[PDB]
Write a protein that binds this ligand. Structure first.
Ligand code: CL
Lengths: 122, 122
């Protein structure tokens, strides 16, 4: 034996040290976040442009929730792990919950049923 | 299975112990294979359904060449490493060169411009 590295779990896809999961049906932002935590994951975070482009391409025609939320249109975007969004990429709209749509990041109320993405480290 | 290295190279995407690259611009099958070869890779192979489902999604709304070829419509499909295709999935048509389109595998002659995906092992 030599030393090897864990592959993403079955049905998860890797970019770098991250593993990502794309849901098979649409629910609200709260349900999506609960789902991700039940998978020892979080609603999806991206930390660079390579991850962000992957997430946008792979979610495709399905508008997809990710793990950014703000208390109001006046408060900073935060990840679900309660760290600040670094604001490298613009989020459109005036909503408190972020989602990917075509090649844009947008925002809306949480109640809308959308596909979602989970991410975890591995 | 387990991976030989911690991650895919930058800009490649991982499913289990394989790493994939989407061309992002279209050319003929022959140019596509030469490109993959120059990256120490090949036109995309899949060795299971998970990998195939990933490729059918990773290509987005574009078709994509893959690494299956045959001498004629009356010869068995082979991978670009010339190992036999295990025939788990049907391939439509009578062309010599395989590509993904929507959720099926089709075939055609080579000098048609299409996107491509490369694959290699991690
Ligand atoms: Cl194409």
């Amino acid at each position: 034996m030599n030393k090897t590295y864990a592959a993403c779990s079955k049905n998860w896809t890797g970019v770098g040290n991250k593993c990502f999961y794309f849901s098979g049906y649409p629910r609200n932002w709260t349900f999506a976040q609960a789902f991700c935590m039940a998978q020892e994951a979080q609603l999806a975070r991206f930390d660079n442009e390579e991850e962000l482009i992957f997430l946008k391409r792979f979610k495709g025609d399905f508008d997809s929730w990710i793990g950014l939320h703000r208390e109001s249109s006046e408060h900073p975007w935060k990840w679900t792990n309660n760290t600040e969004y670094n604001n490298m990429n613009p989020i459109l709209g005036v909503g408190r919950y972020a989602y990917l749509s075509s090649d844009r990041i947008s925002s809306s109320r949480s109640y809308i049923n959308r596909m979602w993405i989970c991410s975890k480290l591995n």
